[PDB]
Amino acid sequence: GAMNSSNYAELFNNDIKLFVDDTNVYRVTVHKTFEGNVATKAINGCIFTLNPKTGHLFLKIIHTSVWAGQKRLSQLAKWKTAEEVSALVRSLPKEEQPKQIIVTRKAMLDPLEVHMLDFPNIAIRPTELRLPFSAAMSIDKLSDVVMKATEPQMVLFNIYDDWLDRISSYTAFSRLTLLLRALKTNEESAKMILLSDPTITIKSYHLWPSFTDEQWITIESQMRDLILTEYGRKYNV
Amino acid sequence: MNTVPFTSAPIEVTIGIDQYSFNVKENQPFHGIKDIPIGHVHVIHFQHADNSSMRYGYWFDCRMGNFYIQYDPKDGLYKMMEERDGAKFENIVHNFKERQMMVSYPKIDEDDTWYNLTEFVQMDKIRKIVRKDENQFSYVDSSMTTVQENELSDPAHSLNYTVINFKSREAIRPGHEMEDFLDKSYYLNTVMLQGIFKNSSNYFGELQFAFLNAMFFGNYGSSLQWHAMIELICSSATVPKHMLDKLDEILYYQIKTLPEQYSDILLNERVWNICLYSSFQKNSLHNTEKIMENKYPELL
Numbered sequence: 001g002a003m004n005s006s007n008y009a010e011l012f013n014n015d016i017k018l019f020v021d022d023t024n025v026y027r028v029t030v031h032k033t034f035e036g037n038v039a040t041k042a043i044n045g046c047i048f049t050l051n052p053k054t055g056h057l058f059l060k061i062i063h064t065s066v067w068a069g070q071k072r073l074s075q076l077a078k079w080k081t082a083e084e085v086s087a088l089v090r091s092l093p094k095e096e097q098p099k100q101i102i103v104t105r106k107a108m109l110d111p112l113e114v115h116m117l118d119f120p121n122i123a124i125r126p127t128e129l130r131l132p133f134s135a136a137m138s139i140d141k142l143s144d145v146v147m148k149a150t151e152p153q154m155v156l157f158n159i160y161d162d163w164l165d166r167i168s169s170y171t172a173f174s175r176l177t178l179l180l181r182a183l184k185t186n187e188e189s190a191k192m193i194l195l196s197d198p199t200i201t202i203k204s205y206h207l208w209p210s211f212t213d214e215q216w217i218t219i220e221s222q223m224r225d226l227i228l229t230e231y232g233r234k235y236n237v
Numbered sequence: 238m239n240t241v242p243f244t245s246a247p248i249e250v251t252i253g254i255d256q257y258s259f260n261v262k263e264n265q266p267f268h269g270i271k272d273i274p275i276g277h278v279h280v281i282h283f284q285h286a287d288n289s290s291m292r293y294g295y296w297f298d299c300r301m302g303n304f305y306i307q308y309d310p311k312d313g314l315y316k317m318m319e320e321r322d323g324a325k326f327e328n329i330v331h332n333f334k335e336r337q338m339m340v341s342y343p344k345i346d347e348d349d350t351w352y353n354l355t356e357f358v359q360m361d362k363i364r365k366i367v368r369k370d371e372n373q374f375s376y377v378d379s380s381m382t383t384v385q386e387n388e389l390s391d392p393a394h395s396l397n398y399t400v401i402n403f404k405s406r407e408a409i410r411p412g413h414e415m416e417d418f419l420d421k422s423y424y425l426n427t428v429m430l431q432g433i434f435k436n437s438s439n440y441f442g443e444l445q446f447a448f449l450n451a452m453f454f455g456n457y458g459s460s461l462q463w464h465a466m467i468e469l470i471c472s473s474a475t476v477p478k479h480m481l482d483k484l485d486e487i488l489y490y491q492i493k494t495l496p497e498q499y500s501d502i503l504l505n506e507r508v509w510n511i512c513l514y515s516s517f518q519k520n521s522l523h524n525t526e527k528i529m530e531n532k533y534p535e536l537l
Contacts, residue, residue: 075419076415079414079415082414083414110404110418111414111415111418113404114404114409114414114415114418115414117404117405117406117409118406118411
């Protein structure tokens with residue numbers, strides 16, 4: 001059943017698994033019409049499909065053209081997500097196919113289950129974890145490839161850069177979730193913390209800056225402080 | 238008008254005949270049920286006074302042979318049997334009638350309830366759901382599991398209802414996943430009606446048989462089957478007009494006949510709320526919606 005705090009180490013065992021987040025698939029700006037009615041304009045989106053063990057990110061870019069002339073787009077977005085995840089699994093060699101797919105939102109369970117009927121041995125699971133993968137579009141290089149796409153495109157990233165050379169996949173996931181939680185709670189402050197020192201850059205082939213082990217402890221502390229402040233404001237406590 | 242004689246009634250038992258029921262005392266001079274209407278299937282059912290667990294009974298049709306009940310003290314139940322000697326049977330029935338040791342099937346002339354519950358139910362379809370081909374009658378009880386329940390154990394004592402599964406390759410055409418899941422018309426009309434049942438009469442027959450097994454035996458798998466067959470129609474955007482009008486009549490008599498005190502265990506809140514208020518057919522079941530709203534407004 002559901003993935004929670006109680007079975008967290010399971011993410012870093014040797015059974016291939018993928019998280020799927022559909023938050024950024026269907027994105028709109030809401031605006032006034034000439035007549036003073038309200039309308040939406042879709043912008044490019046993405047499916048966030050992540051192997052938490054390896055850091056391998058399958059970023060499927062959702063071009064606005066896929067919504068053209070369709071109805072009930074928030075419903076279609078879940079089925080299009082399930083169609084693309086199913087296509088991704090079928091494109092992988094058997095030994096690379098996941099044994100489990102964990103959806104960050106329970107509304108993805110039936111669409112994914114129905115698209116994966118051909119794979120009865122792949123378990124489709126929800127999670128009780130509140131994962132901040134919605135903030136993926138606060139990572140500059142991921143936002144840039146989504147917004148520039150002129151057609152449907154799959155782009156492959158490692159969301160952990162080269163961290164696994166120095167740290168375990170448990171620690172790499174904890175760092176990623178803290179960075180994304182900070183970016184989600186206060187994007188401006190998080191981005192300031194990450195780029196305030198101009199001497200630490202982002203490699204062409206990386207997403208995040210080239211921090212030493214000591215600079216990561218400092219960064220990680222600044223992110224925790226950002227999150228607690230913002231919490232004391234939200235709730236006046 | 239046909240007769241099901243009883244050899245004797247050695248144990249205290251509540252006897253059902255269709256929607257009617259009678260208490261018989263241990264060793265009471267009870268020798269059976271007369272004036273049973275020809276032209277319908279019937280069910281004769283039992284609940285022992287000393288173990289109210291295991292409701293059990295027999296589906297039969299008096300046109301197919303001469304049937305009687307005899308208590309078996311080894312297996313501890315009332316068994317249905319066929320008498321092949323016509324003249325012996327007629328002589329047994331005539332004696333018991335002359336001595337007035339038989340209860341009369343108590344049909345009110347105005348009352349079409351049993352017809353309305355069994356309209357599409359045929360003995361030949363019952364014998365395919367309940368497999369025991371050496372008998373012309375079919376045994377059902379409270380505990381018998383369905384072929385679908387056995388997949389999720391003794392195959393011989395199973396109810397072979399048609400398997401309906403909304404998240405199955407049978408239900409969903411490759412490349413029409415969202416369409417087929419949100420609109421079950423393909424599954425209802427091509428797979429189930431044209432493919433398996435051949436016509437709406439056979440589909441309704443199984444639906445009505447599943448309801449009656451749920452109601453008379455508290456058979457949980459039957460109840461699941463009755464709800465699945467309702468939900469498959471209500472979840473289809475494209476259903477023939479005659480099927481919707483007939484479904485409304487079927488469900489109306491089922492809801493009308495259900496004991497008020499069993500609605501809590503025999504009716505699935507989710508399915509009925511979905512069928513009457515959210516589904517494509519939310520506005521197609523006028524009679525059913527009115528009786529449900531007036532009889533079971535709590536469930537909704």
